[PDB]
From Swiss-Prot, chain A:
Inhibited by isatin sulfonamides. Inhibited by BIRC6; following inhibition of BIRC6-caspase binding by DIABLO/SMAC, BIRC6 is subjected to caspase cleavage, leading to an increase in active caspases. This is Caspase-3. It comes from Homo sapiens (Human). Heterotetramer that consists of two anti-parallel arranged heterodimers, each one formed by a 17 kDa (p17) and a 12 kDa (p12) subunit. Interacts with BIRC6/bruce. InterPro entries: Caspase-like_dom_sf (IPR029030), Caspase_cys_AS (IPR033139), Caspase_his_AS (IPR016129), Pept_C14 (IPR002398), Pept_C14_caspase (IPR011600), Pept_C14_p10 (IPR002138), Pept_C14_p20 (IPR001309), Pept_C14A (IPR015917). Changing R165A: Abolished ADP-riboxanation by C.violaceum CopC. It is found in: Cytoplasm.
Length: 235, 233
């Protein structure tokens, strides 16, 4: 038994929180091309057999609340839990429409002692948001368990860095995560899928700008795993 | 391709920074039994065919200076790079014998653009050090310059890291055990996943004082790798 039990009646919920438009008081631009991401996500996870629920333009208060409700549901019949966050952010932070929520505040609702029906089941958080402003110039070659266990955070960039979005095909990371889940969810283990995602983002993408500052910029996502087991979507 | 090229003339360097004794001005206590870890790590990585270099009780300047030099070597004929840190720490920082060093400072020496002979090769950083003071109560029952890095932390962000003076630290004890048993079989991520399960299930703190009793720990895999990693073939 080196892999999670994924043959529970349901695979689980998959909450997509999609933030496109922010209050004038924040002074944050609208996130163009994000609805593409939310639609790609919804289809991908439907196919994996997740119970998808899309939420658009949520406030900081609305995020906490939705996470509170979802955490208090009964996940006994559910294999796992997934939560995708699409928005602006900084290191450790995602923005609701009216301002910042600490990621740790949304994730703690699910800590193995606050959501018993998820204990020992994989908690997955996919985060498409900036973790800072650094830009990657690239380089040429062309029993008891810990309450913090069973979490996986799949960030779109390295700590400190900007996360790139294309207005037409959505964010680099989500685009690549979906393509890769569709292609490999039936064969590969989840780390190996996210690893392939890393290569796709790292090698197939390069920013374009009339501004040399913002031009030719690269990106690598960042996989963060406190999973105790192998994770396969198929049985 | 899917897997890193691990058939260069050499596996690579495995630098082990092991700090036991700290300077009086630090107020820091000595890290009893840490040598057990350093020893264990030495045998393990030697058996993985790495050129192992052990360093004991380095200052913050010495650590930075050591990393700077290693990053300036020619790693052309080397498959990967490994550096293990055994010391006191805080979120994002490890301790020299005489004070703090930002981790980001030591890793930056090996950024794809600063260590050109390591570009496209796995850079592994294994960190046995606190990332804060929190205790876990537990519960019932062209490429990017930041690419090809992996961090094997002993704990989750914000948390303390447990060590047994005699038997070795929970994490390094489990890592070494797991590498010994599986480096010839599994891909690295899956090894480290076994490390998590092992630390999470097999270890539990004991104290006469409730504050410190029955505490748990989970390690934290941070991967910006772009390929699978097999220590063989």
């Amino acid at each position: 038994d080196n892999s999670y039990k994924m043959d529970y009646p349901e695979m689980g919920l998959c909450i997509i929180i999609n933030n496109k438009n922010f209050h004038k008081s924040t002074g944050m631009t609208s996130r163009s091309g994000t609805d593409v991401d939310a639609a790609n996500l919804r289809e991908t996870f439907r196919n994996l057999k997740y119970e998808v629920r899309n939420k658009n333009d949520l406030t900081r208060e609305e995020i906490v609340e939705l996470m509170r409700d979802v955490s208090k549901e009964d996940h006994s019949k559910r294999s796992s839990f997934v939560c995708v966050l699409l928005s602006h952010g900084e290191e450790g932070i995602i923005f609701g429409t009216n301002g910042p929520v600490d990621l740790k505040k949304i994730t703690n609702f699910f800590r193995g002692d606050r959501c018993r029906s998820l204990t020992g089941k994989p908690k997955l958080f996919i985060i498409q948001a900036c973790r800072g402003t650094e830009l990657d110039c690239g380089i040429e070659t062309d029993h008891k368990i810990p309450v913090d266990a069973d979490f996986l955070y799949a960030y779109s960039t390295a700590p400190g860095y900007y996360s790139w979005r294309n207005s037409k095909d959505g964010s680099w990371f989500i685009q690549s995560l979906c393509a890769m889940l569709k292609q490999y969810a039936d064969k590969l283990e989840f780390m190996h899928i996210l690893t392939r995602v890393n290569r796709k983002v790292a090698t197939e993408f390069e920013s374009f700008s009339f501004d040399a500052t913002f031009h030719a910029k690269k990106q690598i996502p960042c996989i963060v795993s406190m999973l105790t087991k192998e994770l396969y979507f198929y049985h």
